[PDB]
Every structure is written in structure tokens, then in C-alpha cells.
Design a protein around this ligand. Sequence first.
Ligand SMILES: Nc1nc2c(ncn2[C@@H]2O[C@H](COP(=O)(O)OP(=O)(O)OP(=O)(O)O)[C@@H](O)[C@H]2O)c(=O)[nH]1
Ligand SMILES: [Mg+2]
Length: 166
Amino acid sequence: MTEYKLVVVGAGGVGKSALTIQLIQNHFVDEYDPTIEDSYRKQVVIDGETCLLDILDTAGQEEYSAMRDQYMRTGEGFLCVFAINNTKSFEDIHQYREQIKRVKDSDDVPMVLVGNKCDLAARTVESRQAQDLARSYGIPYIETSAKTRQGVEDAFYTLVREIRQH
Ligand SMILES: Nc1nc2c(ncn2[C@@H]2O[C@H](COP(=O)(O)OP(=O)(O)OP(=O)(O)O)[C@@H](O)[C@H]2O)c(=O)[nH]1
Ligand SMILES: [Mg+2]
């Protein structure tokens, strides 16, 4: 079947694993459990197409740079995640986007900007500023909560659709 190589990136603790585990395992992980590199393979049906989601859940730790170019080259689509209560994670998005573009030789790679932890009250990043950033990249902006599952399928399925349209 058609396989989609999806890669979730972003700063440490923004919820990359929590989003992925919600998608694949239907629950919220509330624990501290930093990732090195996890792979998830799941057969799904999206818009009537049988497909395999091949998802790589990456490390936010900056001490894992080298591993990054490797996975950025083979991924077809990227979720670039920040947390809406962590401005530094938002500011970091530019560095992940630039790194992906450079290793993929492309300024138009399938990507979604994901503002996670939208269940939380203490927001520090306004949705308008992330939407503006996303428009500047020409990609969709989707807000999510791994906690409540708000937006989770929407983000991953939107990314699959971006890959389909590439
Ligand atoms: N309130 C809430 N907390 C969340 C949400 N997403 C993740 N978290 C919490 O934030 C913490 C870090 O979430 P992870 O999913 O481990 O973060 P990560 O981006 O995978 O981190 P690294 O693997 O270290 O890069 C955890 O305590 C999760 O429970 C979310 O949408 N809402
Ligand atoms: Mg993780």
C-alpha cells in the first residue's frame, strides 16, 4: 500500500510524542518521558485510501543534531510542533523549518505548523501570530491538544493530504 513517511519535529516537551501516541494509541501520556527516536507504523484508511502511516517521533534534545539530517531526508511530510504556552518553542520553529528545507533541497516541502497544548489557559503564543507565520511559509496552521485529542487527527490527516498534493 501507499505509505506516508511522516516526521514529527519541534522543541523538547512541546508534545510530539503525546500527539503521536494519541493518534496511534488513543490516550494521553502525562508523564515525563523524553524521546531519542521512536517509530510508529500503523495501517489506516484516510479518505477511503488504505495506507501506512510510517511516523518518526524525534528528539527535541539539541544534542541529537546528526540524527536529524538523516530523518529529515527520508521524511515526506513534517509536523513542526510548538507549544502555545512556550514562546521559545515557537521561536525555534524557524530553525526546524530552515533545516528541513536545506536538507530536502526544497522550499515547498509538505508541512503543517502545529500549535499544541491548546487545552491550556496560560497561552503565550497568540493564534494570530502562528497563523501569520504559517501563511508566510505557505503551509497550514492547526492547533491541537494531545490531552483532549482536539485537532490531532486533523493535523496528521492534513499532512497526508499535503503530501498527496505535492
Ligand atoms: N496540557 C497538555 N500537556 C501536554 C500536551 N501535550 C504534551 N503535553 C505534556 O507535555 C509533556 C512533554 O510532552 P511529550 O509528548 O513527552 O513532549 P515531546 O515533544 O515528545 O518531548 P521530547 O521527546 O523530549 O522532545 C508531558 O508532560 C505531556 O503530558 C497537550 O496537548 N496538553
Ligand atoms: Mg517525545
